[PDB]
Amino acid sequence: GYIPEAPRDXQAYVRKXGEWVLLSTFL
Amino acid sequence: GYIPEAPRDXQAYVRKXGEWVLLSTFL
Amino acid sequence: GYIPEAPRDXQAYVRKXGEWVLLSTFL
């Protein structure tokens, strides 16, 4: 389906397996 | 809700606080 | 407009030029 909003916490998110996941976990 | 397309400028973006921000910020 | 789902292969994606691109290519 279409992409929904990511969390409001001020952190950056990327898209993985139909979810928003913190960018920092990949870096 | 469903979010809008990111900028079309040829750069890569991540989602942060209800906006699109440049990936390069974090790399 | 709205954005289609990223690939569902378990990899992380970022948004670039109306496409999902692998985060890994930018690291």
Domain ranges for chain C? 1-27
Running DSSP on this structure, what letter comes out for residue C4?
B
Residues after which a C–N gap over 2.5 Å breaks chain B: none
Angstroms from B27 CA to nearest CA on chain A: 8
Nearest CA in chain B to A11: B16
Nearest to A3 by CA among C13, A15, A13: A15
Those residues whose C-beta lies under 8 Å from the C-beta of residue B14, and which sit 6 or more positions away, are A12, A13, A14, A23, B20, B21, B22, B23, B26, C14, C15
Q: Kindly list the distances between the CA atom of residue A13 and the CA atoms of C12, C26, in Å, as whole numbers in the listed order.
A: 10, 15
| Type of residue at A4 | P
Per-residue DSSP letters for B1-27? Answer: -BPBPPP-SS-EEEEETTEEEEGGGG-
Sign for the CA dihedral angle at B16, A14, B24, C17 comes to negative
What whole-number distance in Å separates Cα of residue B27 and Cα of residue A7? 21
What whole-number distance in Å separates Cα of residue B1 and Cα of residue C16? 21
* C27 interfaces chain A, CB cutoff of 8 Å: yes
Q: What's the CATH code, domain B1-27? A: 1.20.5.320
Which subunits have 3 or more CB–CB pairs within 8 Å of chain B?
A: A, C
